[PDB]
Design a protein around this ligand. Structure first.
Ligand code: 24S
Ligand code: 24S
Ligand code: 24S
Ligand code: 24S
Lengths: 810, 810
């Protein structure tokens, strides 16, 4: 049908069709008379999957022969989404399969909707891992993703009476065609026990053993015949576990609970034993696998030449003392050499500055669970602090600030300090974030070892986030500049010479309108909601957090409503305001924010004076597959975190690539996005990081804003009095009181400038041609935000490997 | 290589080889350089499996069109063993696969050894279900096996210091190529709750729901292109289960524990809640599936014309009140019509007379777990007892003896009484067992409804139990009489005209010697034990029980040892005495018996005066796959239960088919075996049922035998004094005291006649030619004991269906 989706040759279509029928019969054990759409999806998935295997075997064969330096990307989260379409795209099979299935009397799009999301992450950090794997494969790096195969991923979100309800994400119920179980490569992981000191060093004894069983998932690069591996570990009890009889067998679940469920906290630390077990489990099994692969190439001097370990936040920080444990206790290297090897092998990426998000493990937990690791940590700390003492003599406060061991009520280990001490590189995830790390929370470390500190601005994959979710846009782009930009997103700059091209302007705007129409119909079919596709699509989608300021959006929404009720017969640009996202189950305020959004919708959406001029929709169960639908449909991207709080953001980049304009603060990657596009082409408002600082020093007083802004006062009074909750007038008292007395994120301080900036957005939307020209200038300068760029910088500046765009033989 | 294993045509071998390579590449994701024997086994299993699918789909299609009466065989146990060889045999692929794999440079036999046993049963009752499924498919019946897919089957038995250790049977670890998950056909099962009475009848409300997910396994008939289904249910929690958050997800295991592990009791009742849950789970899910299939053909009058339900013991007895529940509460039939439908649908097979094996569920358990079922049971009981009162007026003691409700400390439900009241047929499993049912434990029921009571003597499948495990014997037989006997075992009678044939005699004896040599080498390879293949192979393999009298065998063994030590230079026929079997984990005496056997071995096997004249081996981890090895190798089958205790036995039949002679009591099927072969051709000894009765009335006094038999006295003194346990002299005091003061099974009473009969066995073995002629007379008269015969009698006399030997189109 469309060019970028590949060729539909006669030989290929015929072949796909017969393999489809073969799988339906032999694999699914069905005939055409009993088969359901789900069966058809599976026959298609197996047919496509077969095309991966040859490439998968030869990629891994190639790495064995050439022996390049291997990259190990360690994360507790891989937010993968669906795999079928992505595989077709990267293998250039999309048109061929579309034809084959059409000829079988099937609609491929309908079959695509059956696949469950692999929801093995919470949000930004998990999705970054998934974009990174895609780019690493596309760039020909010998890269392996390592994590945990959770039986239950992020919960499905139901909205009931305006409240979030959680239900188990049973994503494996029908089976996962994309994973290959590898029980033959099962490895032991040790817990508890005690340390014995002998003639020749320490020994960790009387441990409980949990088995780590790997499941491999293929990761295809873009049209280069490279297929890398994501290896996810699953917990299994040994066969003599607890071995009355019946209970012993039933108690096996105690060990297997390790890989059962993803912790659903975004940017928040919870110090639970099960979470710590998860962190060690992934690290211990992964490191044995790395060492095994290295030995099958005595001399650990070459280890850092053959191995890079990237730590995705502090969650796998135990890799540092675990590598020390293995090198010192088992391989019998001396401490100093082991340490040199570890530092040169490990690198650490920080994803947040929020204090409540930082991992600080109680010492009594590590003592019981990982006694040898605690001893190694103490020894790391002592040797590190001697270096500090020698560099900054007499600075006794620096000693306590930098210690890996924190003093107080309960002693804790600061995992971030551990990572910096044990890594040769530390990076933040956008220029402003990395600067903040050097100036504030890691200042002392930066002064000791300035050479460690780097920036690697985040990116997103243009395969999933343009070609896959927005074929129409990808196609009009390819018509003018070719197909090469898909793996070199910088070529989008060439679109600048089309900014005054009348045909292009029409095409860009036509693609948006079609995406909006398709999304508006999706909303009716699956959720029975009536929206106007001519309105401005104002969207904020991301996890529910106070720092992300969904509440600031709520205040704008109510202001628009109040202004309409004030002057009903005055003209306003119609808006559909969409807010979606999950709240962590224990996060009371986030759950209150969701309830507020639905309550506002309940009033706004049923007021006859408003008409179809303002709609407020809560997008239930926001996840990767929903993002692929709503992002192409958006006109306005809401990126409105308090300056200094959002480390980077990646949702922002997605919207930029797909033809939305951005309203946002100078936070995270927003700064670099506006710098690339030009500030005139961005809707920037609000305090900068410097303004926030000034306000903190003086003291933030919310009452001041309330007193001086009548429109704001009215909203607070509406909230307090029960305007949005007639039956429970006090429902939102917690929200009001937080806003008035304990707002860490200064929602009121940005309100006036936000409302003003929102008026300027509305003015620009009244002029379709100029709106679209600004869109073209955004799309055209979004190239920097490809994860291919990000990964090439990791490769060159951290891992010491050269990327390659060269094909492997087919 | 050999005739009965089918043709190895050029087209077929070529095809198998390429499908083997296709699976290795696409299915296993391996190449020949990294593949292990386990991978090769899997490629073979998938290749063979493909041949089932077409036949499987058309068999089930055929049943849909023809709509025959369906047979549902309900069991908590299906002891299947391995499936690969069985499938090759029934599909006539064995030689072709042997050739194909040979040409690939592989040994098929070695690949066969990799497959795990499906160990989903304890012993006789479970293996009977598996033989029955095979015969039902071979006879073209529309039959379905229904049970539970246990995650852990019967435990693996390790012997450590002479003691049994249990370890989890993790049979699914590498995956099961033979099952197809059918998540689309998942069904709800209800537990707990309470009964509400409304205008229109009772309603069972506030229940907890557990999901039943089916897994289908193909069951091929012998060379007739019939493939039936065994459907096993697996327990799954619903997605809103318990829905802090993390705990709720982890507590899902509480629901899923239902299908976790097989209860490992043979012929013994344990009244545990989890066991009851298992029994209801299988019944509730199965019955919904039956009713669904019946409706997809309003009028339940035709239900018994279209459905037979066979209850394998009382374990699925809850089918009776569950069918009543569904018909009365949900379909709104009146009681009397529902009851008529139930009786005509259900039939009950009894497998034991032992009182401790009978299920008697406490009322307080059913009250909490299944409140509606208890009410229905009470109502069944009341209406049943009114029939008894009307037939036997004034017989008040008959009323209390026959009640389904037992009075006393705790009120209990007698599940056996439930089954008889609610079934149109009740059968025992051998003629003497069925007679015992009518004369003793079910006398009152027999007097009320004589027409209900039947016999169906057990049988074994000649596919697994001759062709598969003993190809050499199957081949020399087929050379003389053709191949037709494999599905008509009565044709073996024709071998009687070969009893004086010198060529045959030589061939029969040659096959045994080769089986003994192969087994002797197996013992060295896997267990490092030195046995003499010229000795008589004296074997007792079965579950360890006091009623099976492994202890009587032990006494003989010690007697032989003492006689040798007494007269060392006297000649005795050399024996290898093999005893194997598992003890239930809670069964202290059974575990002591195992320890005794190994202790005897420790003394006997290392005494230089004995030499290779007597060896005592405990066969560790006895299971279906081990039975297939040891049975073909046996010379003497030990079938020595106290008369009246072994309902049938099936191991006995296996040995008879494979050329062992039988030493045994007139118990269970032994009576019919000796009747078929002639008593002159059987080594019968001991009390008959009548002699046991006489002894009970007088009072069994073990001291009397001890006083009058010096050889027996010596053994007891050796046991008491610590001869077989020098370091712990009192180790066996529990055994001695049981034998002397509380022996329910009268071991001493049969000792003298057993020893005497054992001398006569030894005399016959001294004359090879006459031993072998007696063997031929046994093999030749074993036809009655084919499960094809058994199933044809069930079909004609209970189910009301005609078997058929006709092929379906290929
Ligand atoms: O991971 N993959 O996407 C992929 C690509 C191509 C072929 C198989 C796979 C994954 N297979 N994963 C699994 S668990 N395969 C399993 O392999 C077993 C024997 O090892 C077979 O019994 C099963 O038929 C198959 O499901
Ligand atoms: O990964 N997590 O969601 C998680 C689980 C449990 C405890 C802390 C966390 C921390 N999450 N931190 C996250 S999502 N940080 C996010 O990372 C993205 C990728 O670089 C950035 O673009 C965002 O600015 C940042 O907030
Ligand atoms: O039951 N069988 O013996 C049998 C005969 C022929 C083909 C498949 C089977 C059993 N397959 N059992 C299972 S769980 N197959 C599964 O089917 C899934 C889709 O439904 C696929 O994702 C997997 O590749 C496959 O393992
Ligand atoms: O099936 N079980 O092993 C079980 C588990 C839990 C409680 C009672 C039992 C009862 N088992 N009863 C058994 S094995 N009876 C056996 O059935 C065979 C087949 O007809 C007969 O040949 C045997 O004579 C009989 O003992």
């Amino acid at each position: 049908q469309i060019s970028v989706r590949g060729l539909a040759g006669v030989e290929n279509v015929t072949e796909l069709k017969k393999n489809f029928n073969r799988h339906l019969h032999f694999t699914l054990v069905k005939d055409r008379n009993v088969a359901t759409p789900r069966d058809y999806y599976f026959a298609l998935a197996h047919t496509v999957r077969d095309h991966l295997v040859g490439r998968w075997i030869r990629t891994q064969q190639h790495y064995y022969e050439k022996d390049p330096k291997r990259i190990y990307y360690l994360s507790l989260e891989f937010y993968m989404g669906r795999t079928l379409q992505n595989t077709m795209v990267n293998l250039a099979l999309e048109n061929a399969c579309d034809e084959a299935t059409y000829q079988l009397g099937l609609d491929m799009e309908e079959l695509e909707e059956i696949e469950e999301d692999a929801g093995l992450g919470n949000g930004g950090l998990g999705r970054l891992a998934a974009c990174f794997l895609d780019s690493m494969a596309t760039l020909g790096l010998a890269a392996y993703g390592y994590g945990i195969r959770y039986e239950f991923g992020i919960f499905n979100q139901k909205i009931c009476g305006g409240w979030q309800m959680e239900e188990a994400d049973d994503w494996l119920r029908y089976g996962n065609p994309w994973e290959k179980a590898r029980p033959e490569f099962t490895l032991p992981v040790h817990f508890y026990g005690r340390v014995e000191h002998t003639s020749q060093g320490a020994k960790w004894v009387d441990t409980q053993v949990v088995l780590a069983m790997p499941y491999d998932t293929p990761v295809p690069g873009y049209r280069n015949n490279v297929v890398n591996t994501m290896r996810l570990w699953s917990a299994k009890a040994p066969n003599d576990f607890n071995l009355g009889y019946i209970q012993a067998v039933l108690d096996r679940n105690l060990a297997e609970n390790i890989s059962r469920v993803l912790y659903p906290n975004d940017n928040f630390f919870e110090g639970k034993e099960l979470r710590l077990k998860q962190e060690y489990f992934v690290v211990a099994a992964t490191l044995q696998d790395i060492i095994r692969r290295f030995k099958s190439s005595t001399n650990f001097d070459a280890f850092p030449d053959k191995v890079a370990i990237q730590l995705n936040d502090t969650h796998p920080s135990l890799a540092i003392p675990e590598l020390m444990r293995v090198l010192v206790d088992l391989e019998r290297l001396d401490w100093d050499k082991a340490w040199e090897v570890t530092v040169k092998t490990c690198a650490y990426t920080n994803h947040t500055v929020l204090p409540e998000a930082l991992e600080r493990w109680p010492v009594h937990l590590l003592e019981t669970l990982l006694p040898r690791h605690l001893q190694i940590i103490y020894e790391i700390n002592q040797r590190f602090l001697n270096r500090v003492a020698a560099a900054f003599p007499g600075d006794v406060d620096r000693l306590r600030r930098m210690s890996l061991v924190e003093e107080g009520a309960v002693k804790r280990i600061n995992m971030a300090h551990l990572c910096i001490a044990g890594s040769h590189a530390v990076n933040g995830v956008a220029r402003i974030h990395s600067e903040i790390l050097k100036k504030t929370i890691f200042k002392d470390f930066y002064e000791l070892e300035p050479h460690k500190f780097q920036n690697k601005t985040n990116g997103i994959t243009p395969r999933r986030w343009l070609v896959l979710c927005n074929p129409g846009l990808a196609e009009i782009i390819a018509e003018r500049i070719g197909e090469e930009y898909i793996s070199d997103l910088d070529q989008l700059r060439k679109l600048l010479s089309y900014v005054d091209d009348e045909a292009f302007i029409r095409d860009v705007a036509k693609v948006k309108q079609e995406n909006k129409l398709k999304f508006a119909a999706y909303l009716e079919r699956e959720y029975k909601v009536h929206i106007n596709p001519n309105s401005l699509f104002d969207v904020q989608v991301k996890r529910i957090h106070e720092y992300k300021r969904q509440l600031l959006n709520c205040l704008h929404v109510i202001t628009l409503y109040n202004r309409i009720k004030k002057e009903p017969n005055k003209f306003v640009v119609p808006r559909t305001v969409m807010i979606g996202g999950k709240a962590a189950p224990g996060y009371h305020m986030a759950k209150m924010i969701i309830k507020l959004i639905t309550a506002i919708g309940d009033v706004v959406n049923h007021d006859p004076v408003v008409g179809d001029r303002l709609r407020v929709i809560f997008l239930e169960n926001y996840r990767v597959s929903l993002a692929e639908k709503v992002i192409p449909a958006a006109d306005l991207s809401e990126q409105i975190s308090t300056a200094g709080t959002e480390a980077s953001g990646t949702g922002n980049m997605k919207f930029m690539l797909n033809g939305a304009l951005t309203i946002g603060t100078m936070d995270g990657a927003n700064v670099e996005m506006a710098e690339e596009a030009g500030e005139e082409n961005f809707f920037i408002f609000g305090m900068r990081v410097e303004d926030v600082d000034r306000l903190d020093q003086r003291g933030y007083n919310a009452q001041e804003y309330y007193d001086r802004i009548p429109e704001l006062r009215q909203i607070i009074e509406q909230l307090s009095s029960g305007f949005f909750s007639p039956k429970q007038p006090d429902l939102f008292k917690d929200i009001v009181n937080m806003l008035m007395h304990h707002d860490r994120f200064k929602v009121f301080a940005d309100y006036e400038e936000y409302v003003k900036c929102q008026e300027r957005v509305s003015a620009l939307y009244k002029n379709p041609r100029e709106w679209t020209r600004m869109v073209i200038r955004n799309i055209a300068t979004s190239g920097k935000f490809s994860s291919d760029r990000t990964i090439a910088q990791y490769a060159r500046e951290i891992w010491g490997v050269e990327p390659s765009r060269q094909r492997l033989p087919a």
